[PDB]
């Protein structure tokens, strides 16, 4: 009974996932391993290739629309910020496609997203990352980790920890059906500050976590300790976002010429 209902519940969350995110992990790994295709990502590894990419690749956000140019490291930061805001929009529609999320009063929906999207983002980021770099422009480019390490502090320092997380997270070998549940549990989190209806959010969270528990038994039958490992990963993500916010505060304080998107400004006010 319990296992039956939770199976259907998981499927609806998976559909919400497949319906709203621009790239699946299945698609990402196929590009990053070059398994299939006639097209390979253009590799961005230094200044010259970054420029060739802005001259050639199609970006969701127009280069001319980014805040005025300042310098290479900042430009990269602007592209990171564009993609973050675009992922916030996707996560908002994903959450909204979950009926128990949409049933919450809108103010609770905002609180969950405000305190949850960065955790979800850095979890999902692992899908487009390997040890050597990550996909950009809807899979049309691949920016190398080494290049990103070469940017000046503080922009190199805010990037590398996410790769450290992602490589360890990818070793658990989750698929998109696992991630849908996992991301749903990050967003529907009853611990978030200022929540109005905590018990309702806690109950939803618990339902998702039980659904995920049973999902991993069927989908990863030989993986021992995988469910508790993922609970630790959720705790790990909180710490990763604490550090990230700390670094963002330092960027606000010391990089005054660097523009921060207003939506992310609204996200950081309280952390
Ligand atoms: C996490 C995702 C959203 N992301 C950013 C990103 C990846 C890994 C580590 C850090 C990082 O962003 C730290 C800044 C955060 C911003 C503001 C905020 O905190 O909301 C990216 O997908 C991305 C996009 C474009 C590029 C790029 C383009 C040309 O050269 C490089 C590199 C990455
Ligand atoms: C699109 C979902 C993500 C939204 C993230 C930003 C949330 O910002 C918050 O919006 C509230 C008004 O609604 C204000 O009361 C808070 O002061 C502000 O911090
Ligand atoms: K990897």
UniProtKB/Swiss-Prot annotation:
Gene Ontology CC, one term: chromatin
Keyword Phosphoprotein (UniProt): no
Signal peptide feature range: none
Free-text tissue specificity from the UniProt record: Ubiquitous with maximal levels in placenta and skeletal muscle.
Primary residence: nucleus
Disulfide bonds: none
Assembly mode: Heterodimer with the retinoid X receptor. Interacts (via domain NR LBD) with CRY1 and CRY2 in a ligand-dependent manner.
Function: Ligand-activated transcription factor key mediator of energy metabolism in adipose tissues. Receptor that binds peroxisome proliferators such as hypolipidemic drugs and fatty acids. Has a preference for poly-unsaturated fatty acids, such as gamma-linoleic acid and eicosapentanoic acid. Once activated by a ligand, the receptor binds to promoter elements of target genes. Regulates the peroxisomal beta-oxidation pathway of fatty acids. Functions as transcription activator for the acyl-CoA oxidase gene. Decreases expression of NPC1L1 once activated by a ligand.
Protein name: Peroxisome proliferator-activated receptor delta
Organism: Homo sapiens
Highest classification ranks of the organism: Eukaryota, Metazoa, Chordata, Craniata, Vertebrata
Gene coding for it: PPARD
Residues of the full protein shown: 170 to 440 of 441
């Amino acid at each position: 009974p319990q296992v039956a209902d939770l199976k259907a519940f998981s499927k609806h969350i998976y559909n919400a996932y497949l319906k709203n995110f621009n790239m699946t992990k299945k698609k990402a790994r196929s590009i990053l391993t070059g398994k299939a295709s006639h097209t390979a990502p253009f590799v961005i590894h230094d200044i010259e290739t970054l420029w060739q990419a802005e001259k050639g690749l199609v970006w969701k956000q127009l280069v001319n629309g980014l805040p005025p140019y300042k310098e290479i490291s900042v430009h990269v930061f602007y592209r990171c910020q564009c993609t973050t805001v675009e992922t916030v929009r996707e996560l908002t529609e994903f959450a909204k496609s979950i009926p128990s999320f949409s049933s919450l009063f809108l103010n609770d929906q905002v609180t969950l997203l405000k305190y949850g999207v960065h955790e979800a983002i850095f979890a999902m980021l692992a899908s487009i990352v390997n040890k050597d770099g990550l996909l950009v422009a809807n899979g049309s480019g691949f920016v190398t980790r080494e290049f990103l390490r070469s940017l000046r502090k503080p922009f190199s320092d805010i990037i590398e920890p996410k790769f450290e997380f992602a490589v360890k997270f990818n070793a658990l070998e989750l698929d998109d059906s696992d991630l849908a549940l996992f991301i749903a549990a990050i967003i529907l989190c009853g611990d978030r500050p200022g929540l109005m209806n905590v018990p309702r959010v806690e109950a939803i969270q618990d339902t998702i976590l039980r659904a995920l528990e049973f999902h991993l038994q069927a989908n990863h039958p030989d993986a021992q300790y995988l469910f508790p490992k993922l609970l630790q990963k959720m705790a790990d993500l909180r710490q990763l976002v604490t550090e990230h916010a700390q670094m963002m505060q330092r960027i606000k304080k010391t990089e005054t010429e660097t523009s921060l998107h207003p939506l992310l400004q609204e996200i950081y006010k309280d952390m």
